[PDB]
Each structure stands twice: as structure tokens, then as C-alpha cells.
Amino acid sequence: RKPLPRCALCLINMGTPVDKKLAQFNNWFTWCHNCRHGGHAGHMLSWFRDHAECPVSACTCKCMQLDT
Amino acid sequence: GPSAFIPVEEVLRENLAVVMGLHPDYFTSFWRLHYLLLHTDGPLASSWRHYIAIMAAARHQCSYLVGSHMAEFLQTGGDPEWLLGLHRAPEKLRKLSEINKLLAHRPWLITKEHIQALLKTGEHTWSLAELIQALVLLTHCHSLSSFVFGCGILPDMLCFVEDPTFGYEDFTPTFRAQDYTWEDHGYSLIQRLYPEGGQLLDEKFQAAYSLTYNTIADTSVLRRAIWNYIHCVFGIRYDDYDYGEVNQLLERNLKVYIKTVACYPEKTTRRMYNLFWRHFRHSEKVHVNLLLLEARMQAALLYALRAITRYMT
Amino acid sequence: FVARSIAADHKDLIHDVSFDFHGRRMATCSSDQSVKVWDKSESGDWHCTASWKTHSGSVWRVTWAHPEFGQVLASCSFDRTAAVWEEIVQSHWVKRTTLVDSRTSVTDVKFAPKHMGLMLATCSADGIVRIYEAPDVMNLSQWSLQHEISCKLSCSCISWNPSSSRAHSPMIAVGSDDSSPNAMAKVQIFEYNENTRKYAKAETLMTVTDPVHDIAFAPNLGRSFHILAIATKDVRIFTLKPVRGPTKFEIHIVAQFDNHNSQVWRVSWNITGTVLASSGDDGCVRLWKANYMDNWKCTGILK
Amino acid sequence: VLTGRTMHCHLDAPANAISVCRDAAQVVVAGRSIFKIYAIEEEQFVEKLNLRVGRKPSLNLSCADVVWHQMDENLLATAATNGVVVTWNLGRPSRNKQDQLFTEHKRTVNKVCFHPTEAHVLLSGSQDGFMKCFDLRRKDSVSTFSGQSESVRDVQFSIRDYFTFASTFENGNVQLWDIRRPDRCERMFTAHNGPVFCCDWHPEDRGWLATGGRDKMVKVWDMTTHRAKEMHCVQTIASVARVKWRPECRHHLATCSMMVDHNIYVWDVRRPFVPAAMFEEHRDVTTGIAWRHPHDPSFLLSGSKDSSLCQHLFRDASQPVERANPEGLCYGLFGDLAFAAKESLVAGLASSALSVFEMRWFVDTAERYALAGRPLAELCDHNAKVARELGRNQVAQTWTMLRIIYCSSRLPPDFFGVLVRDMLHFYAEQGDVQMAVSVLIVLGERVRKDIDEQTQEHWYTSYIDLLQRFRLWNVSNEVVKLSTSRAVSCLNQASTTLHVNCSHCKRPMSSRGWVCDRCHRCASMCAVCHHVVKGLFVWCQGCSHGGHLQHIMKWLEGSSHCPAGCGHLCEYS
Ligand SMILES: [Zn+2]
Ligand SMILES: [Zn+2]
Ligand SMILES: [Zn+2]
Ligand SMILES: [Zn+2]
Ligand SMILES: [Zn+2]
Ligand SMILES: [Zn+2]
Ligand SMILES: [Zn+2]
């Protein structure tokens, strides 16, 4: 019981509860394999749709285009 | 064998938990109470609850509960440096030692001034909900420390105590019995400050008070005798009981045994255990050496709740 | 403006309604000893989601906490207590703690601003107000009591100051209710004193003598002073400018609105904090705004 | 007509029980160490007689329940702590007017009673699950019953009838008997989930019994039918000790608490949530509640454990309903004024009505502005166009003027600094930070070295809070990233980095690789395309499976199974 990581966008800590949808896709983890910066799936999808830089301030690499 | 006082063959025919298994109902109730008190989330943290258990078991020199409790305190995020002593402990439990004194040795000096100084404004203050858990914890650990030696169960400390030469005084403002009783007054207060604790304490108290005695020359009279005698040891006097039956219903060997167990539990020996009622079965000597913790806990809780009630009146 | 009547399905007077952080949820309470939560839908409809019983006395003010800590509520009632109810995942609300320290009924409970952690303040009818704190954020059951203040008079309302700057120390306003004909002030200001780590006496509104029934601080958003509101038999708005012990203040009076011809019960500000709202015994809601020259005037009457 | 004010006399010892004679002139007050009698006067009650006058403090005086009689003012009766049903007849002038002493009970008696029609028949009830009946002809006994339950409390006796008789127990059942048939209980019905501490009939309505208990409930039962039919139920603050019915009315009670609460409440059985009346002149729990009336509406006696005895009046009661807050309103995010008020404030006084009465520029401008990436002129012109397209004109003029001032026999260089700073203060002061923050970000070092740090941090934090309130995360993070102060460009650098592991070796991998040092298996393979994932990597928590962000979304739209293959619905549909 120590705090889990948080989205770089929501600043809210992550988590998923381990018909009625118990744990939607938008709340899953997702992270850059070069940065190790992560967040919710939905917020990262929205951020990289209109932008192209690592969501965290002072980070540099272009996270999405590395693999696409 | 778990115990050097009870024969291993007797235990097999009928680490200290397996001993209490010969009674099903009370084993279940005690395990429920222990689970709620020490494991479930509540007003205090788990590390603090284990430390409280440690300080309440390091009062009768029970080198069985001052063990596993410190062995599971470390595995719950606790500070390893704290075990150096109370001098290393934070200035939040230092207010608890003075009341830990009488809750194990001499219950009758508790009063409003003690709880008030505990609930005093400053840089380290308790609330009601977070000290009522503490006192219930202390009473539970004292009762377990008494019972473990009451069965003589086979599996540093002096740096954890303040003035460790206190002891229990014989006795002679007595406590009148049916002036502040659990079933009417105290239950409401404990339930209001602690709902689940009150119900579990209630179930424990009636479960222990429904056990039979079998071998007897009407298995209720000796129960009442062994139930009220320990109470008048502490200061609560029931006026209705005729106290000739107390001496006329319990052998002096039984009396010295129960006093040795409930006052100075480190003083019991195998000769002390066997010197009373050799013609019986060990569960009969267990159901008697096992109700004394319940009577002790009842008296301690009644005294503490009388102390706390006056603080609001 | 239009209205949409909602079937309360309560058994007694509704006391308060409070809105979620994101504006999509709202919570209700009543003297029928219950709390209900309503969420808006796609077609702008309101429907119930939870109707569980909370206390055993008349349930007064119910508040929401910031969703950074989760979906955690709070309440006070005739039972001299205070709860920190939380919703967990169908979903249902489960209790977490019960602060039982006051000898008299707890009147109001208000969460602190985010920038000072998770805190909770409760005012008691006998005149004692107390601040709590939960340093272990992830388990809302280790609540501790940090400060205790004596108000020498009955307490009816409480309001935090949302100023997020580090040039403003935290401060809390206390609303009295005693009607005894002995004059004396009602509203008082308590200001944190981080030098000594205690709440002090900062200012006292001497011009207030009639019973105070609700209080509120205006959201700041960038303002360099403080704006206060008071729900007396009239509606008053105060302005407090700190001069560069506690800080010394300058207390001015801006509005002396008396077109309710009744007793004003509640006051509520906006998010940007430029328009005020209030309701009185007459029965309608008024809105007040500034005419860009420190000259407030009514801008609507909703009934 | 009785005429008394609100007065409180004094006692030297705490009391536990009160009884009232038929003449409404004298009252019995008694406890463990007091057995006096008091007489009610027009102005002040004064001491009259002391029944406890024995030379030694014997144990057969510590009463717990005292009852007078309604047709013989000389008769008295009480229950001593250890079972002694000692009766007192004042006719004998021999000072301590005692009478037939009884000791034929086993344990602590709890309450005694009397027949309101006869003066010889006596009842009793104690801890043994027994009910001691007696005949005052000095007989031997009458009909000692077997309750087959736990401690009996609040025995009492019927009012209109002559033979009915009820009694409530400690585990939670109430019974009903008959004198002539002492073998079996006529009626059997459970009432509470705890000790039943109280019982009383209804003087007016026949068969309408009302019981109270430690359940913190008070329930009125209908005995007209053959079953135990409930009619009402009242929730209270604490355990209910005494339940008393006010005369000449049909729907009012009077209940006193047993712990914590020191207050009497006069509940209306119709309105069970808020008390009608309230008395607050005491310091400890009020042990006894008794009337003063054969039938009068507004006179109540009381007695507590603070050694006090006082008379009450309905008129002087601190009525709480008349002095409560009836309304409540709050503002919403966009505008959602929700108003609640009594049904007597909007148009039959115990209900409310709920209604909701019902900023786009802020939201529209948030994502439509431009903050960096282009030279000053491009940003200024684009922002001016964005403002003009909405309706705000002065802001567009400010944009254009800033572009003229910066993007330029010459004016002095630092000539416009005060004007720009005053603009920033003017826009920030009136509560519009969307302009001050944006202008600060765009102009950068040209103006940032003119304002103090605290005010800048205030602007930034307030604007970010407002933005997050509307769920505009993109622009909020945009402000975070380009924030010109150190204290704001740190919010997303705190606890946002994960630690990645290999599921075959269970050991960490470095921060800039996709392969395993011991395993050698490339541990970044999408479960859809079987290709190396070098960028974004989604991860289900119950499967430890995942892959490309885009692939997994399409697969999860298509079906509800883990693509790697394992019985697991990663979303539970
Ligand atoms: Zn990064
Ligand atoms: Zn997110
Ligand atoms: Zn990256
Ligand atoms: Zn590997
Ligand atoms: Zn892939
Ligand atoms: Zn899987
Ligand atoms: Zn899965």
C-alpha cells in the first residue's frame, strides 16, 4: 500500500479494478519504451493526436512516431 | 508438545492456538476478535497496533506475545530502529505508559485526571476513537498474557518498561457492582465510540459465559463462585452473592492457583498446576484457567469505561 | 431561465445540495436521516443512484471532496459525529471513519483547499471548532485531530479561504448564531501562524450583531485581496486588504442589500467569483454583480 | 387548574425514580441514598418529610422503583436493590411507617406496579425471568410466574381492562398474561433487537401499546387483531429508558435517554424524524419522567442523577423546529443553481421542493488559441483572429497592440514596460487569467522579469485548476510544459515514471532498451502483429499481456478476449 504512478496529463494516480463494464480500456496503462513515461490510454491518445512530444515537461523524444 | 504442563498424550487425545481449539465456540469468537482488532483497517495504523500489543504484552513477561508481535511488526512497514526502547519511540506513546501501568498491575487508581492528560492539546494528541482502540488492545493483550502462562505454553524486554518493579498489591472507595454494568451502561458507550468492537466483545462475553463444567459432586454454582471471586479480587462487590459459598465452594488449592495466575502469572509451576484437582480432565482445568482472562477483561473494561464516562458528565 | 422540478422522494426537509467538482454530480441530504446521490444523463435528466442511510439524527450540511483523493463525501448530523463516506467499485458507498469528539451536535463540515492536503473542519454548537488531517492519503481511516479553537459563542457556519497563493496563509471564518440581547460580534477570522504553528485571532467584524445564518468566501482566481459574504437578515459583502502575530487587515463594507424583506438563509458564489447568489424567507433567489466601479447591483430574480 | 412556573429545587443525593399521587400535590423522589417526599406548591416546592430515617444505612432502603396508589393516598410501595418488595403505609403514626416486608425473591427486582382498580393486588418483576404476584391480605403469595426469559423490566398493568397484564424482557420479547390463568402467556411477539427498557399503554386508545428499547427505536403496536401489528416507529439518538404518554392528546410521547443524552423529547408519533419539544435543564441523564396530571396537557415532572427535581411546561420548551434552516443552494460548473426550500416557502410543513435553474467563451478559446512554435507576429495575429471570431474585441486590440509594441529618432527601449505590467495586473485582477497567462507565455522573457514569482505562480495555478475543472487536459498540460516558472514545470515530473520487468526472468530492464539481459527474449512484442514495440505499450493488469496502443484498441472493439490467448475478458465486456 504505497502510491501507484500517475498520468502525466490527469496528474491522478493510475489503477484498475483487479454487461456492466468493470474496467474500461481508457483507464489502462500505457508507456513509452524509451522514456518510461506513462498515463491513461485515452488521455495519451488524445494528446498525441494533436501533438507529437513526450507529455512530461522537459522530456524530449517523439514518443509515438518511434514505432509508427 | 505445545505445553510442558499438560501431557502431550492428553493434548493429542483431546503455536499456542491449537491449545485453545478444544473449545470450538470460544476459539471462533476469540479469533474473530483478534482478526478485527489487529488486522482490519481502523483509526490507528497496523504498526502502531503491533507496538501497542508489544507494550501490553511486555508487562507480564510473556515471552511468546512479545515475540511474533515484534516479528510481524517489522513486516508491516514498521521502523526497525524503534525496538531500541521507548526512549527511541516517538513522543506519542510516551503518554500511554502511565495508563499501561495500572491496566496490568493495579486497575483501581484510574480516574478522570488520567484520561484528561491523555486527551490534552499540544503537538501530540489523541482523539476518543483512537484511544478507545488502544485501551481495548491493551486489555486484550493483558488477558492473553495471563492465559498463556495459565496454560504454561512452550514456544531486551527490560529496555521497554518504565519502573519494571511495580507488581500487583493484594488490595487492602470500592466499586459497586450493579451501579455501572456492562449489559446496560458500558455497552452503549463502547458501541457509540466503537460499533464493531462492542459487538465482538459482547459475543465473546456471552460465549465464555455459556460453557459447562460437567464433573461436579448443577454446573452453575461453581461457575458463579469462580466468576465473582475474581471480581471481588479487583474491587467490584456484588451484594447479592453470599460469600460463604466462595470459601465453601472452592478448595484453597484452587484459590491459590487462580490468584497466582491472575496476579503474578510468571510464578506458576508444574507443581503449582498439578497441586489442585488431580482427579479431573485437563479441559476441566482449562475451562477454569480460561475464564479468568474473561473476568479480568470485564473488570478492566468496566473500570476504564467508568473513568471515561465521568469525563463527559 | 427555466426550472426543472425533480422528484425528491424524501420524507422530510431537504437541507443542502452540493455539486461535484466536475459539475455532473450532486448530493442531497435531509432530516429524514439519509443521503442520496444524483448523476446527470445524456438527455440532461437527473435520476437517483444511491439511497443509503447515514446517521441516526437529522442530517445537516453534506460536502464533496476533490476527486484527486477519490469520490469521498462527508456529513454531519444530530448525532454528535462526522463521517467520511466513500464510493467503491455495481458500486456502493461504504463508511471509512466516524469522528466522535463533540458533546453537542455538529453544525457544518467543510473540506480544505487542495494545496494544504486532505483536511476537514467541523464546528460544534457549544463553540468548539476543530481541524482534522489524513496524512496517509490512500486509506481514509487514519484521521487525526490537529488544532482546537474556542469561539466563546455558538457556532453555525464555517467557510474556508480558497486563495492558492503562497503569500496568503490559510484562514477560516466562523459564523455565530446566538440571539441573546447582549450585542457583541458574530463573525470572526482565524489565521494560521506558521511561525508558531497555531491558529490565531486575526480580525473580528464588530458591525455584525444580528444572527449570522450562512457564510462564504469568494473564489480568488487572481485577486489580490479577499472578498467575504454573510447571510444575516441582510446581505453584506466585505473586502479585506492585507497590509505588507497575525497580519493586520482593513475591513470595508461594500454591499448593504435589503430588498429581500426577509431573513437571508444561504449564500453561494460562482466559480470565477464575480456573481453572488442568495435565498431568503421571501422565497426567491437573487444574483448580484459588480458594475465595474465597486458598485454592486441586482442582475436577476429567480423564483 | 394547576398553576406553576418553571422552577428547579435541589436534592443532596442522586435519585432514580419518581411517582405522583392522585391529588397532584406531593411527589415521591427516591434513589439509592434518598427516600424523601416533596409537596408541590403554587410557587416553590419545599421539603415535607423524610422516610429514610433508620439509624443505620441498611440495604433495604436503596430503592430502584417507587409507586404510589391512585385511590389510597396512604399506601406506598417500592423495590429494594436486593430483592425486598417492602410496602409502606403512612396510616401507622409510628414514624418509620413500614409495613409487610417481603424477601421471597431471588435476585435484583426491577420494577413494581399496582392495579389502578384494586388496592390489594400487587405485582413485581426481577432479574430471574420471574413475576412475583402478591395479595396484601398478608396471605403467603399469589401466582409466581415462570417467564422463561432473561431479566424482566417495566412490568406495568392495563388501564381500561382489569385482567390484562404485560411485561417486557431483556433479550427482546414482550408478553401478555392473565391473573386467572397463570400457566401460559396469552400472547407472544418479538419487538426489538436488544433489551426492551420501557413499556406503557395508551390512556385514550385501547390496545395501543408502545415499547422502547436499546435499539434506539420506539414502536407502537396494535393489539386489536390477533397479531402484533405495527403502526408507527420513531428513531431517536440513544437508548430509550422511559416512554410516557401525554394525556388528553393522542399522538405525543415523552422519552428520556439512558446514556450521553441528557435531554427529554416530546415526539409526535405522526412525525417521527424531528422532535416536537425539547427540555435542556439538567447536567446528567434524566432517570425519571412522570406527569403531574390526572388529565391536563402541559405539566411534566422529572428527576435525574445530578440530584435535581424539576417541573416542566409545554410553553417554555425550547422548540427546535421553529428555529432551523429551511433552505440550501449551490452553484454548478457552467450554471446550475439548485434551490431547495420548504413547501410552505414556495407555495404541510415537512417537505421540500428541488429545482435546478440554469462560459462557452472560456472553453472555446482554450483549445483554439496558439501559444508557441511560430514567431511573435504569427502568434499575435492568430490569437487576434481567434478573439475577433468570438466577439471579444478589446482583447484582439490588445493582441495587435502588443505585436506593434514588440515586433517593431526612436522611442526609448524600456518605454512600454509599465504599461504591459499594468495590463497584466488589470486582466488578472478582474478574474480573467486566460489572457494574463497566455500573454505571459507568448511574450516570455520580454516581460517575465518584471513581475514577482508569487503572483506568477498564483496565475498559473488558478488557470490550471480552472482548466482541469472542465476536463481540458490537453491545454492544461500544454500550460504545464511551457510554464515559465520552475515551480509549475514540475507537476508532471513527480511519480510518473514506471519500472518495467520481464515476465520470464522477473528482473528489471534498463531505461533505453527492448531486450532482456538474461532472458535474451525481446520482451516487447505486440500480441496482435508480433512485432517489436518501441514506443507506446498498453498493459492489461489481470493478464500481464499487451501490445501496440492502436492494435489493442481495434482488437478490443472487435472482440473481448485477450489477443495473446488465455481465458480472460480483459474488460469484462
Ligand atoms: Zn518521458
Ligand atoms: Zn490520464
Ligand atoms: Zn518517449
Ligand atoms: Zn527475460
Ligand atoms: Zn502491434
Ligand atoms: Zn491475457
Ligand atoms: Zn486481460
mmCIF file of N, CA and C in Angstrom, chain B residues 194-269:
data_model
loop_
_atom_site.group_PDB
_atom_site.id
_atom_site.type_symbol
_atom_site.label_atom_id
_atom_site.label_comp_id
_atom_site.label_asym_id
_atom_site.label_seq_id
_atom_site.Cartn_x
_atom_site.Cartn_y
_atom_site.Cartn_z
ATOM 1 N N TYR B 194 -17.247 2.820 19.287
ATOM 2 C CA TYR B 194 -16.634 1.711 18.556
ATOM 3 C C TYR B 194 -17.703 0.657 18.322
ATOM 4 N N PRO B 195 -18.388 0.714 17.189
ATOM 5 C CA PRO B 195 -19.543 -0.174 16.980
ATOM 6 C C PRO B 195 -19.191 -1.654 16.898
ATOM 7 N N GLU B 196 -18.255 -2.023 16.020
ATOM 8 C CA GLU B 196 -17.956 -3.439 15.825
ATOM 9 C C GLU B 196 -17.241 -4.034 17.033
ATOM 10 N N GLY B 197 -16.384 -3.243 17.681
ATOM 11 C CA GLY B 197 -15.701 -3.728 18.865
ATOM 12 C C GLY B 197 -16.668 -4.098 19.969
ATOM 13 N N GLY B 198 -17.714 -3.292 20.153
ATOM 14 C CA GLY B 198 -18.715 -3.612 21.152
ATOM 15 C C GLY B 198 -19.414 -4.929 20.889
ATOM 16 N N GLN B 199 -19.816 -5.170 19.641
ATOM 17 C CA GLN B 199 -20.495 -6.419 19.315
ATOM 18 C C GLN B 199 -19.575 -7.619 19.489
ATOM 19 N N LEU B 200 -18.315 -7.505 19.066
ATOM 20 C CA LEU B 200 -17.422 -8.646 19.231
ATOM 21 C C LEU B 200 -17.129 -8.914 20.704
ATOM 22 N N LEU B 201 -16.922 -7.857 21.492
ATOM 23 C CA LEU B 201 -16.747 -8.036 22.928
ATOM 24 C C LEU B 201 -17.972 -8.693 23.543
ATOM 25 N N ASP B 202 -19.161 -8.285 23.101
ATOM 26 C CA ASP B 202 -20.396 -8.866 23.610
ATOM 27 C C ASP B 202 -20.461 -10.357 23.307
ATOM 28 N N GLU B 203 -20.179 -10.732 22.059
ATOM 29 C CA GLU B 203 -20.242 -12.139 21.694
ATOM 30 C C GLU B 203 -19.242 -12.948 22.498
ATOM 31 N N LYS B 204 -18.033 -12.417 22.677
ATOM 32 C CA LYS B 204 -17.036 -13.105 23.488
ATOM 33 C C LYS B 204 -17.536 -13.307 24.911
ATOM 34 N N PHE B 205 -18.136 -12.267 25.492
ATOM 35 C CA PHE B 205 -18.539 -12.338 26.891
ATOM 36 C C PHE B 205 -19.660 -13.345 27.115
ATOM 37 N N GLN B 206 -20.652 -13.399 26.223
ATOM 38 C CA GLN B 206 -21.692 -14.418 26.396
ATOM 39 C C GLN B 206 -21.224 -15.813 25.989
ATOM 40 N N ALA B 207 -20.336 -15.922 25.000
ATOM 41 C CA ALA B 207 -19.829 -17.239 24.636
ATOM 42 C C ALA B 207 -19.046 -17.857 25.783
ATOM 43 N N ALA B 208 -18.209 -17.061 26.451
ATOM 44 C CA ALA B 208 -17.487 -17.582 27.605
ATOM 45 C C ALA B 208 -18.427 -17.888 28.763
ATOM 46 N N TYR B 209 -19.545 -17.170 28.860
ATOM 47 C CA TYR B 209 -20.472 -17.332 29.971
ATOM 48 C C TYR B 209 -21.531 -18.395 29.719
ATOM 49 N N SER B 210 -21.391 -19.197 28.661
ATOM 50 C CA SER B 210 -22.299 -20.307 28.398
ATOM 51 C C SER B 210 -21.619 -21.670 28.461
ATOM 52 N N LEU B 211 -20.398 -21.749 28.979
ATOM 53 C CA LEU B 211 -19.681 -23.017 28.997
ATOM 54 C C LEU B 211 -19.971 -23.815 30.266
ATOM 55 N N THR B 212 -20.056 -25.135 30.111
ATOM 56 C CA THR B 212 -20.416 -26.030 31.198
ATOM 57 C C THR B 212 -19.175 -26.485 31.970
ATOM 58 N N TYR B 213 -19.405 -27.238 33.046
ATOM 59 C CA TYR B 213 -18.324 -27.739 33.882
ATOM 60 C C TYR B 213 -18.355 -29.247 34.096
ATOM 61 N N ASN B 214 -19.440 -29.930 33.728
ATOM 62 C CA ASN B 214 -19.527 -31.387 33.788
ATOM 63 C C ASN B 214 -19.236 -31.941 35.179
ATOM 64 N N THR B 215 -18.010 -32.425 35.385
ATOM 65 C CA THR B 215 -17.663 -33.148 36.604
ATOM 66 C C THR B 215 -17.865 -32.274 37.836
ATOM 67 N N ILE B 216 -18.840 -32.648 38.663
ATOM 68 C CA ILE B 216 -19.133 -31.933 39.899
ATOM 69 C C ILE B 216 -19.868 -32.887 40.826
ATOM 70 N N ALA B 217 -19.689 -32.695 42.128
ATOM 71 C CA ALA B 217 -20.314 -33.554 43.126
ATOM 72 C C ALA B 217 -21.831 -33.432 43.082
ATOM 73 N N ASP B 218 -25.764 -29.504 38.599
ATOM 74 C CA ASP B 218 -25.829 -28.074 38.881
ATOM 75 C C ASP B 218 -24.497 -27.399 38.592
ATOM 76 N N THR B 219 -24.082 -27.425 37.328
ATOM 77 C CA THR B 219 -22.814 -26.819 36.920
ATOM 78 C C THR B 219 -22.959 -25.315 36.709
ATOM 79 N N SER B 220 -23.500 -24.632 37.717
ATOM 80 C CA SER B 220 -23.650 -23.183 37.668
ATOM 81 C C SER B 220 -23.106 -22.527 38.931
ATOM 82 N N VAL B 221 -23.177 -23.235 40.059
ATOM 83 C CA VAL B 221 -22.760 -22.646 41.327
ATOM 84 C C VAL B 221 -21.255 -22.410 41.346
ATOM 85 N N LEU B 222 -20.469 -23.413 40.941
ATOM 86 C CA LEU B 222 -19.024 -23.225 40.894
ATOM 87 C C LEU B 222 -18.650 -22.178 39.858
ATOM 88 N N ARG B 223 -19.438 -22.076 38.787
ATOM 89 C CA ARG B 223 -19.216 -21.032 37.796
ATOM 90 C C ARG B 223 -19.385 -19.656 38.414
ATOM 91 N N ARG B 224 -20.490 -19.452 39.129
ATOM 92 C CA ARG B 224 -20.736 -18.166 39.767
ATOM 93 C C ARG B 224 -19.666 -17.854 40.801
ATOM 94 N N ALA B 225 -19.223 -18.867 41.545
ATOM 95 C CA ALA B 225 -18.178 -18.644 42.535
ATOM 96 C C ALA B 225 -16.887 -18.192 41.868
ATOM 97 N N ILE B 226 -16.431 -18.939 40.862
ATOM 98 C CA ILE B 226 -15.176 -18.599 40.207
ATOM 99 C C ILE B 226 -15.304 -17.322 39.395
ATOM 100 N N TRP B 227 -16.532 -16.889 39.108
ATOM 101 C CA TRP B 227 -16.768 -15.657 38.370
ATOM 102 C C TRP B 227 -16.799 -14.427 39.259
ATOM 103 N N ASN B 228 -17.388 -14.534 40.443
ATOM 104 C CA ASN B 228 -17.473 -13.396 41.344
ATOM 105 C C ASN B 228 -16.255 -13.253 42.233
ATOM 106 N N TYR B 229 -15.524 -14.341 42.490
ATOM 107 C CA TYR B 229 -14.395 -14.240 43.402
ATOM 108 C C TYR B 229 -13.300 -13.399 42.763
ATOM 109 N N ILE B 230 -13.024 -13.654 41.485
ATOM 110 C CA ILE B 230 -12.006 -12.891 40.772
ATOM 111 C C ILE B 230 -12.427 -11.435 40.658
ATOM 112 N N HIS B 231 -13.733 -11.187 40.568
ATOM 113 C CA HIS B 231 -14.226 -9.816 40.531
ATOM 114 C C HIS B 231 -13.974 -9.102 41.853
ATOM 115 N N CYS B 232 -14.304 -9.741 42.979
ATOM 116 C CA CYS B 232 -14.049 -9.078 44.255
ATOM 117 C C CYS B 232 -12.561 -8.979 44.551
ATOM 118 N N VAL B 233 -11.731 -9.770 43.870
ATOM 119 C CA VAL B 233 -10.292 -9.551 43.951
ATOM 120 C C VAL B 233 -9.946 -8.166 43.420
ATOM 121 N N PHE B 234 -10.651 -7.724 42.377
ATOM 122 C CA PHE B 234 -10.335 -6.456 41.729
ATOM 123 C C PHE B 234 -11.046 -5.270 42.368
ATOM 124 N N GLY B 235 -12.155 -5.490 43.065
ATOM 125 C CA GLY B 235 -12.770 -4.392 43.784
ATOM 126 C C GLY B 235 -14.261 -4.245 43.570
ATOM 127 N N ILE B 236 -14.796 -4.935 42.574
ATOM 128 C CA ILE B 236 -16.226 -4.934 42.292
ATOM 129 C C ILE B 236 -16.896 -5.907 43.249
ATOM 130 N N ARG B 237 -17.860 -5.416 44.021
ATOM 131 C CA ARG B 237 -18.527 -6.222 45.035
ATOM 132 C C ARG B 237 -19.994 -6.389 44.671
ATOM 133 N N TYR B 238 -20.381 -7.614 44.329
ATOM 134 C CA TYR B 238 -21.788 -7.939 44.150
ATOM 135 C C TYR B 238 -22.428 -8.203 45.505
ATOM 136 N N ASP B 239 -23.458 -7.419 45.820
ATOM 137 C CA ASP B 239 -24.085 -7.505 47.135
ATOM 138 C C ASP B 239 -24.973 -8.738 47.260
ATOM 139 N N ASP B 240 -25.470 -9.256 46.137
ATOM 140 C CA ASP B 240 -26.454 -10.331 46.203
ATOM 141 C C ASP B 240 -25.817 -11.667 46.567
ATOM 142 N N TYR B 241 -24.605 -11.919 46.089
ATOM 143 C CA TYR B 241 -23.949 -13.188 46.368
ATOM 144 C C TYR B 241 -23.641 -13.326 47.853
ATOM 145 N N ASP B 242 -23.901 -14.512 48.399
ATOM 146 C CA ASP B 242 -23.499 -14.846 49.758
ATOM 147 C C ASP B 242 -22.092 -15.425 49.710
ATOM 148 N N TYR B 243 -21.157 -14.753 50.367
ATOM 149 C CA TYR B 243 -19.742 -15.020 50.166
ATOM 150 C C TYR B 243 -19.206 -16.161 51.019
ATOM 151 N N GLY B 244 -20.043 -16.797 51.837
ATOM 152 C CA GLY B 244 -19.633 -18.048 52.449
ATOM 153 C C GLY B 244 -19.425 -19.141 51.423
ATOM 154 N N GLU B 245 -20.251 -19.150 50.375
ATOM 155 C CA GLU B 245 -20.112 -20.144 49.319
ATOM 156 C C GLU B 245 -18.799 -19.989 48.564
ATOM 157 N N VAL B 246 -18.184 -18.807 48.608
ATOM 158 C CA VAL B 246 -16.912 -18.619 47.919
ATOM 159 C C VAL B 246 -15.829 -19.487 48.550
ATOM 160 N N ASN B 247 -15.715 -19.453 49.879
ATOM 161 C CA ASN B 247 -14.738 -20.305 50.549
ATOM 162 C C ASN B 247 -15.226 -21.745 50.632
ATOM 163 N N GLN B 248 -16.541 -21.949 50.679
ATOM 164 C CA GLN B 248 -17.096 -23.285 50.833
ATOM 165 C C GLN B 248 -17.301 -24.004 49.509
ATOM 166 N N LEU B 249 -16.937 -23.387 48.388
ATOM 167 C CA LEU B 249 -17.170 -23.964 47.073
ATOM 168 C C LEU B 249 -15.903 -24.060 46.235
ATOM 169 N N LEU B 250 -14.751 -23.700 46.791
ATOM 170 C CA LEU B 250 -13.507 -23.754 46.039
ATOM 171 C C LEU B 250 -12.365 -24.086 46.987
ATOM 172 N N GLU B 251 -11.623 -25.142 46.667
ATOM 173 C CA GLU B 251 -10.513 -25.563 47.504
ATOM 174 C C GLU B 251 -9.443 -24.478 47.564
ATOM 175 N N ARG B 252 -8.765 -24.405 48.713
ATOM 176 C CA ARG B 252 -7.701 -23.421 48.884
ATOM 177 C C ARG B 252 -6.635 -23.576 47.810
ATOM 178 N N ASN B 253 -6.421 -24.804 47.338
ATOM 179 C CA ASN B 253 -5.518 -25.010 46.212
ATOM 180 C C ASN B 253 -6.021 -24.276 44.975
ATOM 181 N N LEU B 254 -7.326 -24.354 44.709
ATOM 182 C CA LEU B 254 -7.898 -23.619 43.584
ATOM 183 C C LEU B 254 -7.710 -22.119 43.759
ATOM 184 N N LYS B 255 -7.938 -21.615 44.973
ATOM 185 C CA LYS B 255 -7.818 -20.182 45.222
ATOM 186 C C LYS B 255 -6.386 -19.701 45.022
ATOM 187 N N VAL B 256 -5.416 -20.424 45.581
ATOM 188 C CA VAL B 256 -4.032 -20.001 45.407
ATOM 189 C C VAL B 256 -3.634 -20.102 43.942
ATOM 190 N N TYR B 257 -4.141 -21.113 43.229
ATOM 191 C CA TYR B 257 -3.820 -21.227 41.812
ATOM 192 C C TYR B 257 -4.356 -20.042 41.026
ATOM 193 N N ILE B 258 -5.622 -19.683 41.245
ATOM 194 C CA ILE B 258 -6.225 -18.616 40.449
ATOM 195 C C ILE B 258 -5.589 -17.273 40.787
ATOM 196 N N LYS B 259 -5.273 -17.041 42.066
ATOM 197 C CA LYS B 259 -4.561 -15.814 42.414
ATOM 198 C C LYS B 259 -3.172 -15.765 41.797
ATOM 199 N N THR B 260 -2.430 -16.875 41.830
ATOM 200 C CA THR B 260 -1.103 -16.880 41.231
ATOM 201 C C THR B 260 -1.185 -16.604 39.739
ATOM 202 N N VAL B 261 -2.192 -17.168 39.072
ATOM 203 C CA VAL B 261 -2.322 -16.960 37.635
ATOM 204 C C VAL B 261 -2.692 -15.515 37.323
ATOM 205 N N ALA B 262 -3.681 -14.961 38.032
ATOM 206 C CA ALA B 262 -4.233 -13.665 37.639
ATOM 207 C C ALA B 262 -3.398 -12.501 38.161
ATOM 208 N N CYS B 263 -2.604 -12.724 39.208
ATOM 209 C CA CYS B 263 -1.784 -11.659 39.774
ATOM 210 C C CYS B 263 -0.357 -11.684 39.234
ATOM 211 N N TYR B 264 0.357 -12.782 39.456
ATOM 212 C CA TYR B 264 1.760 -12.918 39.070
ATOM 213 C C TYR B 264 1.888 -14.166 38.208
ATOM 214 N N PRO B 265 1.472 -14.092 36.943
ATOM 215 C CA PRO B 265 1.447 -15.305 36.110
ATOM 216 C C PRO B 265 2.812 -15.931 35.878
ATOM 217 N N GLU B 266 3.905 -15.200 36.082
ATOM 218 C CA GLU B 266 5.220 -15.812 35.945
ATOM 219 C C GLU B 266 5.551 -16.767 37.084
ATOM 220 N N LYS B 267 4.747 -16.794 38.144
ATOM 221 C CA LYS B 267 5.051 -17.584 39.327
ATOM 222 C C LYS B 267 4.508 -19.005 39.268
ATOM 223 N N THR B 268 3.683 -19.333 38.278
ATOM 224 C CA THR B 268 3.091 -20.660 38.224
ATOM 225 C C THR B 268 4.134 -21.706 37.824
ATOM 226 N N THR B 269 4.003 -22.896 38.407
ATOM 227 C CA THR B 269 4.904 -24.008 38.125
ATOM 228 C C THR B 269 4.065 -25.252 37.862
#
